[PDB]
Structures are given as structure tokens and as C-alpha cells.
DNA sequence: TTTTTTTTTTTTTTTTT
């Protein structure tokens, strides 16, 4: 902006800006409906301050409830509300009521709810009173508040007390209760984690019991109303002084899980009780929430505030209970906590700053320039609180690795920060900082940012026609118990028919209700589903209102994933000797060491068994076990397609076991880990499988911790612990590193399968618990999926396997392969694997598609088409033509772009035919895989398959094909456009590679050469395919053979 | 701005200074 003139013209002045705000709000909250009434959500447009009185702060907002931008309702935040950090484009809900007329909310009237759809937990809001930063770091680095002894006691006691209040507080019954709950595997596990004594906990717990009876005798006695405890209790309700008498009648509800779209709060009410307030001779019955605390009788603000928040959660279900109860089981002493407006306001005010802090994580610095990690709420000056924080580690850490001539932050702390982080180097800090950025950006991506509006705002019918909102349903079937919070429930619709679609039994589902007052209820998953009935497992027992009721079921989705990675990252930063080792190997790229073979690298006795195992393996394979055995640090086994990695890992494990090594065996997916286990079962090799037995493969479920427990009836810390030390081999998934076993066990070796598909910080997990490790992967196959552009561009898709692969000394390749026949191999050998793949045998090499009745198959088709149009059909069916590309150029085959994904019905129509034929030629549909680049194209191909009544063949994306193979693969490349649009997907060399490597015997490829050639991987394909004349161009859609398919 | 997706769930609290 130079000349006088630039300035003149650069003067603006409302609409395109309003539009960019609507874009902005949908990056954060996609598809917020906007509204009036109870569940309003207005969109902020403008934010200014003014001055009343003289030096008093007012905040002036301009908001709208629908898209027509003229419905601008003005709004003023006074007193404290004035400083709530709203910027334009934010989604707000005024629960200080109104909508009818927002106007003025201030100290005395109205609540302001910044980002309502984002429900923050009351405990977090309570935490923030003392330290916002502490609360935020808790919410994001969730593992760094490790379970303590008091916390266990506390849970144990909570559970007993709820058990009691349903039943009796009779001492013998209380004893019976505590005695029983002390044996529950959940608690056994935590006793195990903290290496405690079962009986020591029993005792510690037992001393509380008397106080349970003291309380019950005081408040639940049933007798004269004079003779209940007597306290002042000023409600809103008119009259609130002069004492009155309190009588707990019954517990109505325990562990009431609640979500509030209204205040953007979530919470779990320990106990809901029926209460009678006796008042002279009159009585008033109120259902109120009770909070239990096993701590010291502090009556602390935290504690009270928790109750105040519980009163709000409650409104979402029933009348505003106006006040609630704080217990303190230690001493039996119940306190009244009244939900004053000042408190409710003060807290929702604070809960705004928290909702803000958690949502504003990454900073532009220049609207559209590269990302930054936003600083957190600053470090408090109250050294009393800091002193024992738990989150201090990360606070000091996040500080150093994201901070700022200035500082000016309590010099008392500045030093402790350094004490905490001096073990670290500049690269370690940079590494940490960057992975948090990447992870954050991924986490915040629009895919993992969709809200619960569908659940509580649109009714069930409209949503059931897609995704998942099955339900306007009923139960009558008695709830079966299974264990703790897993109760079996049964559902069906009232009266007649009713459908199914995206409800694949085993999903994540949220059970809500007909009306808005019964939203949330219980979350859980699905067992099995007949299209008339449906059975799904939940945490809550739902008997309270039977038959009257109707229930909508919905799904879920990720993002909060980042907690395990952030855990791992943060762990890597800890100053322990393992964490140093991994820093050096991973961040500082320290060269891994190997030793020279010598006679006694293996225990003498092991040697015979090893040799026998070795003998059954090809050279590359044998060379891989040698590397592992000679390693001091790590080993990278490159498992190129069909080279037998499952066979190989099993062999390794068998060798390592022979040598008296303990080994933690991991992978990304259950099936991946299970496949290896199955082999190991065959070899009679013992191992313990952690993880939820329902996700475990069936033949493996006998080895599960969960299963062995129920089976052998394990109800003691010694018998559980005996189980844990039962096997030196332990198998779990990378994410399942949160098991208590890893608080106490370490391994000689960690093995990670699919090491190249797992996101780097996740893969990092199992490594903390093992001396040496082995990543098995292949970087030519798919990487960890990184949705977000900017992150992918910062390197987030680099697997740990790849990262570490620059040390060649540690890389051993698996090349002898047993899947593809000489011809098909040759393809990927020329395109990708630089001639490195060899055939397992002549069997594998020379194998061709099994088609026992080609003869009558060929005739039956010619009963509409011609013999002379042999070009394709003859070449296609020909078993001895294993690789074949079909050019959809000369017959128009246009794509259909539909809100993101692309399809091609012509191509779909075309391949469905080819499928029918191949089954009819004698090839079992079992042995058939269909692949397509685009998810959308899968639908279409699936449809036309039920249309032609052939549905056993599996249509799926390359991804859902990793590591699996079929006898025949057919690929619809679905791209076919004029000379423009050219998606990112086909540019990817790795997705292509996987497609050309799924087939054993016959590989058939289908797309428009014309537009496909402009994708480098495909261009290069077409070259090798032309050289061998394996592309065969098609007739027009008019020709004798095609016309009958269109 | 170009569409590819598995895991872990009691993920809300259990205390303490
Ligand atoms: N050293 C070997 N000798 C003979 N056959 C092998 C060898 N390694 C792998 N195979 C064969 O390769 C096939 C693939 O191995 P497997 O581990 O079952 O699945 P994948 O290799 O696809 O994980 C198996 O049927 C197995 O018989
Ligand atoms: S350590 Fe002190 S500052 Fe850092 S978070 Fe915990 S409380 Fe807030």
C-alpha cells in the first residue's frame, strides 16, 4: 500500500465477511443448526466494548439465530460476562434463557454459554478454580494423574456405599459388601498396579464402614420427623431460613451419566436420592443429587462447586433441584450445598474460559500462514498449589518447548521448570513440540469435530435413512448382569417391521431416549442384530421406566485419540533411563548396534531347537532372526508383499522364547496380533492375550485374561498376579499399553507388527517396556493415515518404521514371496520393488486362476454376445494371461462426483458382469476381491451385486485390504474425466502398489487410460503394461458384447 | 479442496497439598 491512491481504495464499507465466519464456525462446529428457544445456538457476528458509569466494562455482541443475516439480535455482557473471551464467528447458547429477547446478561440475571456443543466435565471446571492451565493439561495429557492408593480406596468405598443404599446398612451386610467388592477383578488390577496387599486395603476400607451406619441411622431411619438431623436450607422457594429436618428416603439413582447441551457440561452423579424436608408439621419431597467424597472433610470450594454443577446436570433430566448434598464417607457427615446464582454464574463463567482454552489450540499468526501451538493459560503465582501438582512435569515441559526478551513468570517457578527439563536437549524439545502440533491439528480436523445436535435436535426418522439413528424402540427382557457396568439389554420396535443399514453389530453406540429429557443415558456397543430385534451392551441398568419408553440409538467418532499419543510423547520426555535410550535412538538417530555372531550368543540348550526352527525358513527369513539375535538396540524387518510375515514373526517369537527371553508382542489391529497367535497356538507356545475378549479372534479367546479369569474364577490378588506371571510372552495391541501389567512388568523384546502403518507416537508405546525391539513393516505399502493437509505436510505420515530405516545396518528384507505368480510378481517388481521379489517355489510361480468349467461358461455368454469380439473377453478369461488392463477409453465411462467421493456406474456395471462370469467359470466367490480407490464407488458396486444376486465377493478399498490377498482381484479405478479434476488419491504410489499385490493368480484392471495416465504411478504402470501389450482397448458401448450390459 | 479410517471406553472420577 504505497501511493495516496492505495489508501483511498483500500477503504472498505459486510456480507462476504459474514460468510467467512459461517465457514469458520463450521471448521470448528460443522452443521450447527442455529436456533431459538430452549436449545438456542446463535452465531456471533460482532464483538466490541463500551463504557458505562465511567470506567466500567461492557461487551457489545451482535448475534443471529438463522442464516438470513438480517435477524441480527443485539446483546450486552455486563460485569464479569463482559470479559468472557468471545470473538466473532463463535457459536454461543444463552442459557441465561431468553432467545425471546437476549439483550442484557450481567451479574444478576442470565448465563452465557460459549461453545455449548462442547461439554466440559465438572471435575475439570472444579480443577480450573485453582489453575486453569492445570485443568487444561489434565484434559489433554490424561494419563499423568496416575491412580493413587486413596483414589482406589475412594472408588472401592463409593461402590460399596451405592451397593449399600440400594440394600441395607446393617454392619454384617456392609462387611459382606466390602468383602465382595474387594475381590472384583477391576480392583484386583489396581491393587496389582500399585503393588499393594488385598487384605491391607480391605482393612483400610473396613474402618470407614461404621460411618456408613452412622449416616444411615441419622438420615434414613424411618421414625418421628422431629428426630432427623436438623439444618437451615435456604432454597429459592418462597417463605429461606429457620431450621428443618432432613430424611433420605431412598436412592433413586446411582452413577447417573449426564450430558448438558444446555451448559456444555458433562458429569456423573454418584447418587440421586429422594429427600423429605420436614418443616414444622409440613413436608416437602425433593429429588436431589448427592456427591460422595472419601477424602478429608474439607468442605472445600472444589467440592461444593462440584455439587452446584450437579444441580445443573440435573435440570437436563428433571426439575431444578435448587441444592444438593456433599457426603464425606470418612466421618459420615453430610453438608448442604445450595446452588446460589452467584455460584452457578461464577462457575459457568470459569467454564467458558476452559471451553475456550481447549478449543483455541493452534495459532495462525498471519491469517493463512503456517501453524503454531497456542500457549496455555499462564503459570499461576500461587506457589502453594504448584508444589504438589502431578501436571507440573508437563507444565514445565510444555512451557520450555512452547514459550517466550520477556518471560516475566514467577521466578520461583522459572527455576523448577529448569530442574524439571534440564535432562532434555534442544532436539528433544523441538521433537516434542512438533509432534504435539501435528497431533493437535489432526485431532482438530473437521472430520473429528462433528457434534451431538443430530441426537438431541432432529427426531429419529430423518436420520435412520442413513448413517446410524436406528430407533424408536422398546425393551421388556430382563437385564442380564455380565460384570459391573456391562449390562445386557434387548431392543425392538413397537408393532411391525423395521430396517437396518449402518448398524454392523459390534459398533460404538449411544443409547438415548424418545424425548429430550432422556438424552445420553448410557453409551455402549452392539452384540448381535436380527432385523426384528437388536441386542446391545451398556454400562447402565435401565429399569427405571419400562414399556412407556422409546429409544434412539446413534454412533460416535474419534479425535480424543490424541491422548494416548500425547501420553507416549510426554513419557518419552520423562527423565528415566528407558526414556533416555529411546530419545537417543529415535530423536537423536543414534546408530543401532549389532554384534558378531559367536558360539554362545544363545544359551547352549536353546541351540538345537533354534536350528530346527531355522531350517524351516528361507534365507531372508533366517537372516532376519539372525539380525534380531545379534541386535543390542533394534531391528527392522521389511515384510514385502506375500513374503510370510505372520509365519516369520511366529518363528522369531518361537526362537526368542527358546532363548528364555520375555517378549511383548504387539501390532495395530487385533486380527494382526491374533493371526500370529493362532500360528503360535499350533506350535503349542504359551502366551497371555490382553484386551477385550469380544474384539479377540474366537480361537484365541481361550487365552484372554478376561476369559481365563471368568473360567478359572480368579478372585484374589495372588491368583490374578499368578496369571500375569504365568507367561513370558504377552500379546496386546499398541493402544492397549494402558494395562496394569505394564506398571510392573518389563520385557526382553518388544515386537511390533504393521510397524509402518501405525502413527509414530502410537508405535512408541510398547517400546517403553522392552529392552530391544523389532518393527515389522514395509514403507512401499500404506502409511499411517493423516487426514489433515498441514500436518501431513509437517511429516505426520512418517511411520516410526520409516523414520528409523535410514540406519541400514538394522534393516533386513523379506523377498522370497508366496502369493503372486511369476507374471503378477513381475509387475510390482518392475514398478516398485526394484526387481527384489523372488518366487517361493515353481508352484507359486506357475499357478494360474482355477476355472474348472471354462467350456460351457464360454458358450453361455456367447448367447447374446459374439465369439469374434475375442479381443478382451478371450484375453480376460484366459488363465495364462494373469495380468490384464481394460481400457474404458473407446467406450465412454464417465465418473460421478457426489459431495466429495467419486463413482463410475459404467465401470461398476462393467465389473459386476466380469464377476458373475468368473464364478460361472468355476471360481468360488470366496476367492474374489473387488477394489476401488473411492469409498463411494464401493456402495455402487455392492448394489449392482445384490441386483445380479451375487454378494459373497467382497468389495472394499485398498486400505481394508492391507496384508490380505485373493485368487482374483478386479480393480475399478473409477476415475474418468474430461481433462480437468485429478484427485490426490491416485497420485499416491503406495495405494497403487497395494492394489497390484493383492492377487495370487489373476489381476484385472479397469479404467480410462486417458485421464489415468496423468497420475505418475499409473503413467509408469501404463509404460510397463504397453511394453508387454497387456492393455486391451475396448469397443464402444454399442458393440455386440457391451450393449447388453448397458 | 479434494475423500483413504483402527484403535482405546467405562474418558468422568477416584484424592492430595
Ligand atoms: N520359509 C517358508 N517356507 C515355506 N513356506 C512359507 C515360508 N514362509 C511363508 N510361507 C508360506 O507363505 C504363506 C503366507 O504366510 P502366512 O504367514 O500364512 O501369511 P502372510 O505371509 O500373508 O502373513 C503361507 O501359506 C506359508 O505356507
Ligand atoms: S504446575 Fe502450577 S502452573 Fe503448572 S499447571 Fe500445575 S498448577 Fe498450574
Residue numbers in the entry: 1 to 13, 20 to 245, 248 to 412, 415 to 1056
Direct quotes from the study:
Dna2 has nuclease and helicase activities and plays key roles in maintaining genomic integrity. It is involved in the nucleolytic processing of 5’ flaps during Okazaki fragment maturation, of DNA double-strand breaks (DSBs) during homologous-recombination mediated repair, and of stalled replication forks in the intra-S-phase checkpoint. Dna2 contains a PD-(D/E)XK superfamily nuclease motif and a 5’ to 3’ helicase domain. It is a ssDNA endonuclease that requires a free end for cleavage, and does not cleave dsDNA, single-stranded gaps, D-loops or RNA.
The Dna2-ssDNA structure shows that the active site and most of the DNA-binding sites are enclosed in a narrow tunnel, necessitating the threading of the DNA through a tunnel end to access the DNA binding sites. The structure explains why the nuclease activity of Dna2 requires the ssDNA to have a free end. The active site is embedded in a ∼10 Å wide portion of the tunnel, and the tunnel entrances leading to it are too narrow to accommodate dsDNA or a single-stranded loop of a gap substrate. DNA binds to Dna2 through both its phosphodiester and base groups. Dna2-phosphodiester interactions involve protein pockets that are rich in backbone amide and short-side chain hydroxyl groups.
